[PDB]
Design a protein around this nucleic acid. Sequence first.
DNA 1: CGCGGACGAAGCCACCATGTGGGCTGTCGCCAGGC
Length: 259
Amino acid sequence: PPSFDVTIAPWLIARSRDVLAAPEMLGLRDVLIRSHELSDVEIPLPPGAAVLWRILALITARITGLDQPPNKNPKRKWQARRSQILSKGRLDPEAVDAYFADYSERFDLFHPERPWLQDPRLREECPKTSGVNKLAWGRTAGENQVWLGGHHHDLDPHPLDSAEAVWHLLATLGYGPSGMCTARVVRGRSERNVTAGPLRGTVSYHPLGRTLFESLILNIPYPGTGAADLAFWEQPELNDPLGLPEESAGLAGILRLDH
DNA sequence: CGCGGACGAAGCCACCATGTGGGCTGTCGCCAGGC
C-alpha cells in the first residue's frame, strides 16, 4: 500500500550551520530533532513555506508554547518559559516523539482514513477529479492556456513527486482559487462554488535567526488565554461540510489552521 | 431530435534644487644650364 510520512520521508530541504554546501532533504521529525544543527529549512514555493512556517509553529512551538498562560501575568510567564527554552538552545527529542507518538499513525498523507490535511470521504462523492494540474501551482488548469511552465495539455499529465505533491497541497490549503471548483454532492448538496483561501494575496512575515530552533521559538504568536485549541490534523473526527466553522481562541485558530 | 455553441452562476474589497562641448585635408612657374 502507498504510504508517505511527513515525519520520516524526505521532502524538507535543509541547510546546515557549517560548510553551506549540499543541502539534504529530510523529514519533518528529523528537522524537528536536529534544529540547532541546521540554519534553516527551505521550500521552493513561498505559499508552501507560508503555510509551512504556520504548521511548524504549531508543532515544535506548541510543545514549547504550552497552550496555557493562566494567571501569573500570562504574557509575562509565557515570556519566562520562552526565555527558559530559548536559553536551553534546543528541544529534547523525547518530547517530540511524544507529540508524534500521540498521532504517529495519523500523519502519512495517503491514509485510507484520516489523510494529512485532507478529507478521505471526498473520493467517493465527486465524479470528476480536479487533476494534479488543477491542484499544482505554475501548472495549467482546464481552461488555462498552454503557454507557460512547460505545456500541460491535460492529457497524460506527468505526476508530481510525492514530496512535490506535499508542497502544493499545503499551498492550495493556504492560497486557493475561489469560485467554480468541481462540485461534490453531500446528501443532495452540489455547489461548484468555492470561497478563497484565508491568506490569499498577502505577505506573511516570519522572523528568522541564526539557527532553526531560534526561529521556531520566535515564530509563535503569543496565544491569549482562551479555549484550548487543536489543529485540523488534531481534530478527533471530521467536521462535515454543513454547519458552522467553530471559533477557536487557541493559537490553532490564530494560525488559521482550525479548518 | 440531437449536437454544438453561448451564456450564466459566483467570489468578489479603499515652503526651495542644478553645469557641457573638439577630427579632416592638398600644389607648382617655366625653361635653361650646369653638375
